[PDB]
Design a protein around this ligand. Structure first.
Ligand SMILES: [Ca+2]
Ligand SMILES: [Ca+2]
Ligand SMILES: [Ca+2]
Ligand SMILES: [Ca+2]
Lengths: 331, 335, 336, 331
């Protein structure tokens, strides 16, 4: 059905076709190109652009900002803040911004939806219609995995570094280079990294191990924890584990991996004084009664979510999107 | 506000000590060091042994150690605190238990019957709250408890020594263990972490602790936060920062002022995890619940002695209000 | 706000008995005003805020003795006058926060000041003064100079020691126009017929119930005080005279730490059940005096208990609603 | 209906037929004698005599101990206790002693009821069966007020002193003399006496002022307060006020006046710790089931028994006449 491309952590990319690799560079790159070859007709113009900056001793880079071109609308994402720098006289809002759980989801009627975590991880979900007519970091969107290493031109080069360098926004940004092992660079952190990422091999994800392999995710976790010594290693570990959790939720499984000791949430903070209406749902609550989407409306899309959700009481059951409360009716 | 007649020794982070009389200093050394002793030798004025010892261990590549295991020997009993669990190594023939273990909030409250109550968070920090009864009878790393700060460096030799390192090594336990040295500058050792350290520790200068800024200074605590963040380069810097800020938070709450600082962005708490399915009995309390009806406290009795028991507590409904001291639930009654 | 645990006690009760902070005791009387406690000691200003207390003493019988009728407090421009169990506020500027916190406690109208001084009033010629140690060696007046020595008292307003109690009182009197005082005849000699009744009433001091305090506080001086105050007081209400005389010794015993339950339905009774809500029994006599309560002014967790020994009727809140609603006379579960 | 005499304070009297006066003298006086002529009259003889010992330096006598004789049964009463001396194993003990309220009450099957407050005050209740048959200081019960002051040998004189001296018992006791003014003797106490006894004119007795005049009771209060100079004027003041309250409650009016300011009680003292079963009942408790008092015995004994009362909780509702507790059932 709908495809999925994942970008997270220290240059970890998952193509639409399932291919994975690593690539880091202090430059802007296009995760997906709509008008591959400038086919402006019979299609809606859109783009997804990521901004990377080095975030460690080894020089590896991580995503910091997300800029999306969308039919004459340009949106800027940075530290959980959505910004608009592009609009059109049509006055219609093609995109909808929602805060479902920890994720900040933007959906457009054209069939595209981005599951952008507020910190550093971005997920792309595309309708099957755009199969075979998009290209870029996320792949060419067909059933064949090998051909996805195609440059900005139609030429196919097997070098991961060459493929990454080809899709740079401007020649001004420097060419990327193959990174050394952060674990080798900082062997002292290796033991702590292994102990932290051992949860991926723990009993918590044993159920998901059947449908999704943890090996690549395990080495990604340990490498990221070895790196990002400049601060917030807990953030790196949390992002890696959250990426694995979202991958598990892709197939439909649901695991409550979060504990008060590791990567905990603060659902009680959003809770109103005295009144309790918030809980953490590992699977996510689909089709909750909001102002825009009351119980009359519903959508089984964006499968796979987690975080704090408002347990609306039966009285005043419709959630207030802009007031963060449960109300009987909405404006 | 201004207070007199109570004291509490504070040890947290990497060698950050706060004596009973208010002295603050840094220290290091992979050894065991006595914390407090009342007998001050063979002289026992109808008291108990009352000896608290702490074992250190280097954490990080900068040669800076942090507290990992804490043993409290009292009346022959030996209780070891490590890996977040209370362990008892020796039980005396006196069937009367001289200590009570309660998980009040995040802290692992250890309260004794002789007016001594401990405060362990299972993570490289400890607060030794002491009754004013033992005033002037305290020999150890937490000062003389004579309400004088300068003489707290009398060392085990009982001669005042200017060097904090000499003081600590005099109070050291194992002769075979190596002597301490001057700690290296952490931020100088790891320059790249300085910006992140400042960004994290800026919370102390932020508006959240505006009320505490008037009463308790944040400068030393901010310096400790920056130092620990710079030094914690062997993983788990988030825990270092959380403990550093929590020390100042508890110090502010000790004077009586209530301050809420935890946010989902910084040092979050996940007490909804303990919440039974569809109950929401637990909630967040900055000052903590002063007292509640537990299995071990079925009466509405309230000690109300220690201050600022941070964490999340269960707001039991009026039906079945007495809490379960063992099964973590709001039950109708206890055995 | 926060007050230190250390304290010193000065007491005055009945027909003009006094108890200095140092421990010195002396009998005195006079129809004048007297600065019991002086902060600046004659205009010598310091960093600490200036405060001063004074009492109005009127004749209280036909033997010439005087008992403290009205208590006047001066601190930071604020003037508090106490009379007939009420509190008169005269000096008050709203540009500054009120420094005192009046709060009824047992049979005492506890008025607390943020400086470090708390005052206890019995509404019947009885005053208890508690002072923070930070004022040691700085205060002066009838309550003493607050040092370890006791015989070095009788420090006149002229910063001189005269030794004679009468001359000390005359020099530390306030009103210049008011006449000189003098030790009068023995009231028991004046009214010998009441001597037997006085002995019968005050025998409780030598009674078995005070044997525990006998080893800590010598009742002999208190016995003489009780006998003398039972004598005179001929203008009516001798029961109040005897009750406050006994209560002085009881409070002195409570200051040591010992607890005595001396009140019986026959001698100095208290009508605790009067304050009890209809069909409910929460008020109960507490000889010790409960150190702290759960109120709106004092929240559930707050238990500031610097002062001890406040005997009186006290509401024992039910466990379901342990928080007491002061000024509402009920126990609840929350405060606004 | 049933007659009622009363004696209280310094020789203040109120006959059954409403005559009110004052008297004094340190001598035994026959309050009530069942035989006017002293003959058998085909009826057992009951005789009640008190001793008005001097009370106060001013020279006014007041009752201290009260002696009661009937059929060889003597119950010396003093110091708040019953001291039975005279008794007869024949027939059956014709008296039961109870302590309802503050009052100590002894009742006889013949219809004569005595109320004692243990402090210089006595109240008599007599059935109408004895009307026109009794003689004593309390006056002959014949519904006539003028025919009172009946001296011995059935003679009437206008001198209260001579009437009392005729009814005197001790041959050698001194003759009574006209009382002086205690307030004139002690003008200093007069201000306090007036201020304290002004409670009678206060609003708390407004509901009873119309039914019974307070002027005589106020005069008695002020005179006794002036007279009381040996220590304990509170006692005589409380006795006067309680006498007026009992006179009011005899009519049926229900008045509550006890407050910690004036004449306080100590009901809590009887209450055991954690057992607040005792309470103050100014109006009296008509129905009780204390031990000998049968369970569910909601009948009437006397009206106006003001005092602390042990309100029994519903469980174990039988109060203990000797233990001061609520038991299930006394033997
Ligand atoms: Ca492909
Ligand atoms: Ca010291
Ligand atoms: Ca002195
Ligand atoms: Ca008649």
């Amino acid at each position: 059905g709908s495809a999925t491309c994942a970008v997270y952590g220290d240059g970890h990319y998952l193509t639409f076709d399932g291919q994975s690799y690593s690539f880091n560079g202090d430059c802007e790159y296009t995760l997906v190109q709509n008008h591959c070859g400038g086919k402006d007709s019979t299609q809606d113009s859109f783009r997804v652009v990521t901004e990377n900056v080095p975030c460690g001793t080894t020089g590896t880079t991580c995503s910091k900002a997300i800029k999306i071109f969308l039919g004459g609308f340009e949106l800027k994402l940075s530290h959980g803040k959505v910004e608009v720098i592009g609009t059109d006289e049509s006055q219609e809002v093609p995109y909808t911004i929602q805060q479902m759980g920890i994720y900040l989801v933007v959906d457009t009627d054209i069939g595209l939806v981005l599951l952008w975590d507020k910190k550093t991880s971005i997920f792309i979900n595309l309708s099957p219609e755009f199969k075979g007519r998009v290209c870029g970091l996320c792949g060419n969107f067909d059933d064949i995995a090998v051909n996805d290493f195609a440059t900005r031109s139609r030429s196919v080069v097997g070098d991961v570094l060459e493929f990454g360098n080809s899709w740079k926004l401007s020649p001004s940004c420097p060419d990327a280079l193959a990174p050394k092992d952060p674990c080798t660079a900082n062997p002292f952190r290796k033991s702590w990294a292994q102990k932290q990422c051992s949860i991926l091999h723990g009993p918590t994800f044993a159920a998901c191990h059947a449908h999704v392999e943890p090996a690549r995710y395990y080495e990604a976790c340990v490498n990221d924890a070895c790196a990002c010594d400049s601060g917030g290693d807990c953030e790196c570990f949390c992002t890696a584990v959250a990426a694995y959790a979202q991958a598990c939720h892709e197939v439909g499984l649901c695991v409550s991996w979060r504990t008060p000791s590791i990567c905990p949430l603060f659902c009680d903070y959003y809770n109103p004084e005295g009144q309790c209406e918030w809980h953490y749902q590992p699977c996510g609550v689909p089709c909750l009664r909001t102002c825009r989407n009351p119980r009359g409306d519903c959508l089984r899309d964006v499968r796979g979510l987690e975080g704090c959700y408002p347990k609306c009481p039966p009285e005043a059951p419709i959630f207030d999107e802009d007031k963060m409360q449960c109300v009987a009716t909405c404006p």
